[PDB]
Design a protein around this motif. Sequence first.
Motif, PDB file in Angstrom:
ATOM      1  N   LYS A  66       0.811  -1.085   0.057  1.00 40.11           N
ATOM      2  CA  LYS A  66       0.096  -0.064   0.070  1.00 40.11           C
ATOM      3  C   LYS A  66       0.915   1.035  -0.004  1.00 40.11           C
ATOM      4  CE  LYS A  66      -3.982   2.344   2.083  1.00 40.11           C
ATOM      5  NZ  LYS A  66      -3.304   3.818   1.915  1.00 40.11           N
ATOM      6  N   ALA A  67       1.937   1.211   0.760  1.00 46.05           N
ATOM      7  CA  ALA A  67       2.671   2.520   0.819  1.00 46.05           C
ATOM      8  C   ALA A  67       3.464   2.821  -0.608  1.00 46.05           C
ATOM      9  CB  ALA A  67       3.883   2.274   1.884  1.00 46.05           C
ATOM     10  N   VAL A  68       3.882   1.560  -1.358  1.00 45.66           N
ATOM     11  CA  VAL A  68       4.563   1.714  -2.498  1.00 45.66           C
ATOM     12  C   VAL A  68       3.525   2.464  -3.579  1.00 45.66           C
ATOM     13  CG1 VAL A  68       5.359   0.573  -4.594  1.00 45.66           C
ATOM     14  CG2 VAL A  68       6.180   0.059  -2.295  1.00 45.66           C
ATOM     15  N   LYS A  69       2.333   1.997  -3.454  1.00 45.77           N
ATOM     16  CA  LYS A  69       1.421   2.508  -4.454  1.00 45.77           C
ATOM     17  C   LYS A  69       0.871   3.733  -4.106  1.00 45.77           C
ATOM     18  CE  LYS A  69      -0.317  -2.399  -4.979  1.00 45.77           C
ATOM     19  NZ  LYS A  69      -0.062  -2.363  -6.600  1.00 45.77           N
ATOM     20  N   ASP A  70       0.965   4.102  -2.745  1.00 45.98           N
ATOM     21  CA  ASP A  70       0.646   5.650  -2.440  1.00 45.98           C
ATOM     22  C   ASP A  70       1.760   6.227  -2.628  1.00 45.98           C
ATOM     23  OD1 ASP A  70      -1.939   4.562  -1.369  1.00 45.98           O
ATOM     24  OD2 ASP A  70      -1.242   4.541   0.768  1.00 45.98           O
ATOM     25  N   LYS A  73       1.102   7.313  -6.383  1.00 44.68           N
ATOM     26  CA  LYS A  73      -0.038   7.971  -6.603  1.00 44.68           C
ATOM     27  C   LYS A  73       0.372   9.404  -6.013  1.00 44.68           C
ATOM     28  CE  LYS A  73      -4.910   9.004  -5.064  1.00 44.68           C
ATOM     29  NZ  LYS A  73      -4.625  10.150  -4.322  1.00 44.68           N
ATOM     30  N   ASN A  74       1.313   9.541  -4.935  1.00 46.17           N
ATOM     31  CA  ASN A  74       1.445  11.001  -4.467  1.00 46.17           C
ATOM     32  C   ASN A  74       2.488  11.638  -5.378  1.00 46.17           C
ATOM     33  OD1 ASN A  74       3.931  12.369  -2.873  1.00 46.17           O
ATOM     34  ND2 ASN A  74       2.063  12.400  -1.524  1.00 46.17           N
ATOM     35  N   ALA A  75       3.473  10.855  -6.159  1.00 47.07           N
ATOM     36  CA  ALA A  75       4.247  11.623  -7.214  1.00 47.07           C
ATOM     37  C   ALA A  75       3.379  12.259  -8.205  1.00 47.07           C
ATOM     38  CB  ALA A  75       5.180  10.564  -7.581  1.00 47.07           C
ATOM     39  N   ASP A  76       2.189  11.118  -8.709  1.00 45.81           N
ATOM     40  CA  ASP A  76       1.280  11.802  -9.783  1.00 45.81           C
ATOM     41  C   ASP A  76       0.521  13.142  -9.199  1.00 45.81           C
ATOM     42  OD1 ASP A  76       1.965   9.966 -11.618  1.00 45.81           O
ATOM     43  OD2 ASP A  76       0.335   8.731 -10.718  1.00 45.81           O
ATOM     44  N   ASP A  77       0.321  13.281  -7.764  1.00 45.04           N
ATOM     45  CA  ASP A  77      -0.616  14.136  -7.350  1.00 45.04           C
ATOM     46  C   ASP A  77       0.160  15.395  -7.342  1.00 45.04           C
ATOM     47  OD1 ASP A  77      -2.767  12.377  -6.797  1.00 45.04           O
ATOM     48  OD2 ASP A  77      -2.261  12.157  -4.700  1.00 45.04           O
ATOM     49  N   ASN A 137       9.167  13.102 -11.274  1.00 45.80           N
ATOM     50  CA  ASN A 137       9.168  11.959 -12.046  1.00 45.80           C
ATOM     51  C   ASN A 137      10.354  10.651 -12.016  1.00 45.80           C
ATOM     52  OD1 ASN A 137       7.642  13.869 -14.515  1.00 45.80           O
ATOM     53  ND2 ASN A 137       6.889  11.706 -14.013  1.00 45.80           N
ATOM     54  N   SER A 138      11.451  11.198 -11.358  1.00 45.61           N
ATOM     55  CA  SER A 138      12.576  10.165 -10.971  1.00 45.61           C
ATOM     56  C   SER A 138      12.074   9.440  -9.789  1.00 45.61           C
ATOM     57  CB  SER A 138      13.933  10.787 -10.964  1.00 45.61           C
ATOM     58  OG  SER A 138      13.982  11.751  -9.995  1.00 45.61           O
ATOM     59  N   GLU A 139      11.423  10.114  -8.971  1.00 46.64           N
ATOM     60  CA  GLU A 139      11.002   9.541  -7.520  1.00 46.64           C
ATOM     61  C   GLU A 139       9.758   8.482  -7.924  1.00 46.64           C
ATOM     62  OE1 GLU A 139       9.694  13.065  -5.596  1.00 46.64           O
ATOM     63  OE2 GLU A 139      11.776  13.239  -4.634  1.00 46.64           O
ATOM     64  N   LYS A 140       9.028   8.891  -8.890  1.00 42.78           N
ATOM     65  CA  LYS A 140       7.830   7.886  -9.532  1.00 42.78           C
ATOM     66  C   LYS A 140       8.814   6.721 -10.139  1.00 42.78           C
ATOM     67  CE  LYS A 140       3.853   7.225 -12.461  1.00 42.78           C
ATOM     68  NZ  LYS A 140       3.047   8.145 -13.251  1.00 42.78           N
ATOM     69  N   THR A 141       9.710   6.857 -10.831  1.00 41.67           N
ATOM     70  CA  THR A 141      10.402   5.734 -11.330  1.00 41.67           C
ATOM     71  C   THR A 141      10.925   4.741 -10.287  1.00 41.67           C
ATOM     72  OG1 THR A 141      11.145   6.850 -13.531  1.00 41.67           O
ATOM     73  CG2 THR A 141      12.426   5.111 -12.610  1.00 41.67           C
ATOM     74  N   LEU A 142      11.501   5.219  -9.238  1.00 41.87           N
ATOM     75  CA  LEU A 142      12.061   4.424  -8.093  1.00 41.87           C
ATOM     76  C   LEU A 142      10.771   3.713  -7.577  1.00 41.87           C
ATOM     77  CD1 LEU A 142      13.741   3.180  -6.074  1.00 41.87           C
ATOM     78  CD2 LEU A 142      13.700   5.178  -4.752  1.00 41.87           C
ATOM     79  N   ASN A 157      19.357   1.673  -5.053  1.00 44.27           N
ATOM     80  CA  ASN A 157      20.622   2.688  -4.958  1.00 44.27           C
ATOM     81  C   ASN A 157      20.772   3.404  -6.196  1.00 44.27           C
ATOM     82  OD1 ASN A 157      20.598   1.832  -2.372  1.00 44.27           O
ATOM     83  ND2 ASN A 157      22.713   0.869  -2.468  1.00 44.27           N
ATOM     84  N   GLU A 158      20.818   2.677  -7.387  1.00 39.63           N
ATOM     85  CA  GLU A 158      20.895   3.232  -8.732  1.00 39.63           C
ATOM     86  C   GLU A 158      19.668   4.246  -9.066  1.00 39.63           C
ATOM     87  OE1 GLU A 158      20.846   0.107 -11.418  1.00 39.63           O
ATOM     88  OE2 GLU A 158      21.015   1.520 -13.360  1.00 39.63           O
ATOM     89  N   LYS A 159      18.654   4.074  -8.733  1.00 38.68           N
ATOM     90  CA  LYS A 159      17.658   4.845  -8.895  1.00 38.68           C
ATOM     91  C   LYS A 159      17.622   6.216  -8.110  1.00 38.68           C
ATOM     92  CE  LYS A 159      15.234   1.014 -10.858  1.00 38.68           C
ATOM     93  NZ  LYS A 159      15.720   1.330 -12.174  1.00 38.68           N
ATOM     94  N   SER A 160      18.171   5.837  -6.773  1.00 38.28           N
ATOM     95  CA  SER A 160      18.046   6.891  -5.902  1.00 38.28           C
ATOM     96  C   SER A 160      19.411   8.061  -6.207  1.00 38.28           C
ATOM     97  CB  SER A 160      18.648   6.334  -4.622  1.00 38.28           C
ATOM     98  OG  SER A 160      17.501   5.472  -3.917  1.00 38.28           O
ATOM     99  N   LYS A 161      20.309   7.548  -6.707  1.00 39.11           N
ATOM    100  CA  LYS A 161      21.400   8.653  -7.139  1.00 39.11           C
ATOM    101  C   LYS A 161      20.922   9.365  -8.203  1.00 39.11           C
ATOM    102  CE  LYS A 161      23.776   4.742 -10.079  1.00 39.11           C
ATOM    103  NZ  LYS A 161      24.752   4.554 -11.156  1.00 39.11           N
ATOM    104  N   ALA A 162      20.220   8.959  -9.085  1.00 38.56           N
ATOM    105  CA  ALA A 162      19.410   9.836 -10.296  1.00 38.56           C
ATOM    106  C   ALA A 162      18.793  10.820  -9.595  1.00 38.56           C
ATOM    107  CB  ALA A 162      18.809   9.009 -11.151  1.00 38.56           C
ATOM    108  N   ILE A 163      17.817  10.433  -8.557  1.00 36.77           N
ATOM    109  CA  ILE A 163      16.872  11.383  -7.774  1.00 36.77           C
ATOM    110  C   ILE A 163      17.733  12.406  -7.232  1.00 36.77           C
ATOM    111  CG2 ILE A 163      15.322  11.467  -6.079  1.00 36.77           C
ATOM    112  CD1 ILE A 163      14.558   8.657  -6.714  1.00 36.77           C
ATOM    113  N   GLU A 164      18.765  11.896  -6.384  1.00 45.69           N
ATOM    114  CA  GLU A 164      19.850  12.852  -6.017  1.00 45.69           C
ATOM    115  C   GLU A 164      20.515  13.994  -6.894  1.00 45.69           C
ATOM    116  OE1 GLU A 164      21.631  10.867  -1.979  1.00 45.69           O
ATOM    117  OE2 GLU A 164      23.142  11.365  -3.716  1.00 45.69           O
ATOM    118  N   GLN A 165      20.727  13.403  -8.236  1.00 43.38           N
ATOM    119  CA  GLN A 165      21.546  14.402  -9.243  1.00 43.38           C
ATOM    120  C   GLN A 165      20.502  15.398  -9.517  1.00 43.38           C
ATOM    121  OE1 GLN A 165      24.631  14.830  -9.767  1.00 43.38           O
ATOM    122  NE2 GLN A 165      23.753  16.592 -10.697  1.00 43.38           N
TER     123      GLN A 165
END
Length: 192
Positions: A66-70, A73-77, A137-142, A157-165
Amino acid sequence: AHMGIQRPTSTTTDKKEIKAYLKQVDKIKDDEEPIKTVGKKIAELDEKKKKLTEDVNSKDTAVRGKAVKDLIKNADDRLKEFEKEEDAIKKSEQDFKKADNIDNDVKRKEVKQLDDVLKEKYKLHSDYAKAYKKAVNSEKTLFKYLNQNDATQQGVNEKSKAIEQNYKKLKEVSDKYTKVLNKVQKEKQDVD
């Protein structure tokens, strides 16, 4: 003058014109008030996102899922709410171009300079909007990666570094935008 008659000088008439100009610019700025409401709504969404930090690692598979799906949704919102800011700046720029007659050449150049800084404002907002959307969008991808079977720490971790950048870049452009909003006021002080 005969009978001490007084009629407008070029200086008085230019003042009148600068007043009307600064008024069109302030009406447009007023009409951007909805951007403040967007910021508040996105801040509320950011707080809700943080409150899923425990659940995203829950040992209860249902709570975790549920947290992942939320989170998705939250990134979309947040992106959906941000559209209102994008739309507002579009409206503001459309009204701007409609808003010299100034006889005084020194004062007329100050006006052209204010216009140029307002032009830079709209351009830098586009850069800012691009950077913000890329980051969310990069949060959504993770989060989508977490919403399938067999996610790994390496993948996270690989998706996290992109968010950081993306956030590093958003800071660079957000700083530049805040700078231009300040420069807008500096040019107004000179013009007035």
